[PDB]
Amino acid sequence: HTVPRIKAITSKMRMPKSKGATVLNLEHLLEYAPQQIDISNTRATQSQFDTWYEAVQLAYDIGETEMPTVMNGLMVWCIENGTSPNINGVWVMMDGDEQVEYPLKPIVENAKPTLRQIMAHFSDVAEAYIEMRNKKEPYMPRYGLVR
Amino acid sequence: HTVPRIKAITSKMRMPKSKGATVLNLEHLLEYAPQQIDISNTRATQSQFDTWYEAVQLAYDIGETEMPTVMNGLMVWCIENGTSPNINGVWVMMDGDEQVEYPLKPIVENAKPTLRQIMAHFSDVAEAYIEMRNKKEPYMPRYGLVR
Amino acid sequence: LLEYAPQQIDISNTRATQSQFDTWYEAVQLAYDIGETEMPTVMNGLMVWCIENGTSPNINGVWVMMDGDEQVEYPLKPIVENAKPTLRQIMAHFSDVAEAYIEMRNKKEPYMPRYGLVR
Amino acid sequence: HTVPRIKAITSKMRMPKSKGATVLNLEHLLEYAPQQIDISNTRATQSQFDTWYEAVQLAYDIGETEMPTVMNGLMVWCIENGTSPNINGVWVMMDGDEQVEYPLKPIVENAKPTLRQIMAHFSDVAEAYIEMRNKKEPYMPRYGLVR
Amino acid sequence: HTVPRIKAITSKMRMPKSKGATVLNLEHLLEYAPQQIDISNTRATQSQFDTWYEAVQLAYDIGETEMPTVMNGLMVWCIENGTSPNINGVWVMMDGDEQVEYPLKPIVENAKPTLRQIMAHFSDVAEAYIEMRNKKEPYMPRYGLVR
């Protein structure tokens, strides 16, 4: 009478075993549902990102409220330009009609494992930023996304 | 009258012979029916898997009940990412909204003949895990299965 | 010449010579250091292991035979080595038994091997 | 019926023989499983290390509880700098914001066969120390490890 | 009718001749089938090995039953380390958690033509010893085999 429903884990599926016991905790494996970007190696670890963030803030010698504005310009600068730039150089943020100079050594250095992975944390914001700008001008960046 | 039934081994089939005697024990060959994954070289040997399992547990210096939870995260981390990662790196397991860091040297090393073969022991569980997650989100991993 | 009617597998170079096969057989038995009655059971597992896997495996490795729910380890160096001219030709002696073994197993499960036959 | 199991030592393997008798005690050879770092010549012998340890402690004329703190600084000083320094010099340990001077003659001398081999006893601790520091700053030493 | 069988030595093969007579005793040449390791110069002669064996035993001044245990440790010490070590040094054998010191001068000296050739007598046992240890740990020696 009852229409059967199949389980996710059957009693026929071979679990990995070591010394006669299973090596996976299935009571918690089904519950364990992380996000695909939190456990991907294409993104720098949060410990590495916070290591980079306060290392750049201390190198630039700026406060905690001035720091987010720098990241706004650094994200946009990383949209037009690449994530493998010259370490002995500068990156520019606009203050209206006046360019503002920042050394590129504190940024390329202290970014582990790679600036690409550190900059990949801005990918969701970067995509939204381009689409907003693309709605008012033929904006297309030379070097892909911030990733 | 009787409808004949053909034997599996006829008296006309050439057995391998050495010094006049057959080299195969046919009395036990028909009974011998192993599983295709237990005698395949695409999977690491159980002796090698147990060698890897206690070598990782001892390197991480954790108990026997905490160990299965690590393998739950390591399997999922091996779904999104590959089985040939940087040995000088870390792999991440989520504890809710906080990443947990584990060295990737005890994992890539001590896995013989290859991490792929060691990780291939999770293939049946890995396929079920994706299909369960794929039923609630467009989940697709960059690097295939755990194999 | 008219009387001379050999079998097509006894004079084919896709199969190792009987002198070479017996050279391989006692060379593997002596290397494994096992008796004459235990030896055929090893060949039963080695044939099946050569159905799922290939005949060009890593010489620095092992091949597995099942003892129920326990794997049994055998070095693959005495097998790949001492097999002349090639393990393929040495293993080709099991082709008739290998075909029958698969068809028997295929009658109870969707059994299909990655690496063809034992040949 | 029985699936054979191969012995580690077969009755066909040529043992080294002198005057008709074997030169290896096989009853104890299988049991004899030392650690690869206890019988390696890249590490100074324990007799040599203890010879160096009390020779440095006596030369510095310090107690037994003050001595371990000196080795903490000497290990770190041997991470940034090499293990072949000038014997007519000093090595520095920090006491906060004040450098502390120690002669380098009692260290380079009395270390047999080489300071490198004597300092190689700290390799496991040295690797852990760098990885701990590398998690909070881009720490990389000029002269490799303490080895 | 008879299918011919070819001889190993035909009546057309040029034998080496001196003064009209052959220089090889073919009646015994076919029977003469030595082992490839007994007549190879990569291995020290048995006369040289026994010369080395009792020369080391007499130098160490130990009995005939204590001697095989020393060779067990010396073989393993020659797996991790090389066969060209400093003659003015020591080699270590483990007694559990206590190193045991042996001079390396009686070993490097009295070994003719070379310690390598003298130590090559342990090659078969050395290969088996590593494979046994490699089944329980990622054991790999710096300096190849005992050869």
Residue numbers in the entry:
A (entry chain Ar), B (entry chain As), D (entry chain Aq), E (entry chain Aa): 42 to 188
C (entry chain Ad): 70 to 188
Give verbatim excerpts from the published study on this entry.
CP consists of a highly conserved globular core flanked by two large extended regions with a high frequency of structural disorder. The C-terminal high intrinsic disorder region (C-IDR) is partially conserved and packaged in the lumen of the virion, supported by the helical ssRNA scaffold. Here, we show that we can control the shape, size, RNA encapsidation ability, symmetry, stability and surface functionalization of nanoparticles through structure-based design of CP from potato virus Y (PVY).
To prevent encapsidation of ssRNA, we further truncated the C-terminus, excluding 60 C-terminal residues (CPΔC60) containing both the C-IDR and the α8-helix, which is placed opposite to the RNA-binding loop and forms part of the RNA-binding cleft. This indeed led to formation of RNA-free filaments. Interestingly, the filaments had monomorphic helical architecture, VLPΔC60:h, with unique helical parameters. On the other hand, the fold of the N-IDR in CPΔC60/CPΔC79 resembled that found in RNA-encapsidating filaments, consistent with the CP-CP distances along the VLPΔC79:h filament being closer to VLPh+RNA than to VLPh. Thus, disruption of the RNA-binding cleft by large truncation of the C-terminal part of CP prevents RNA binding and also leads to the formation of monomorphic VLPs.
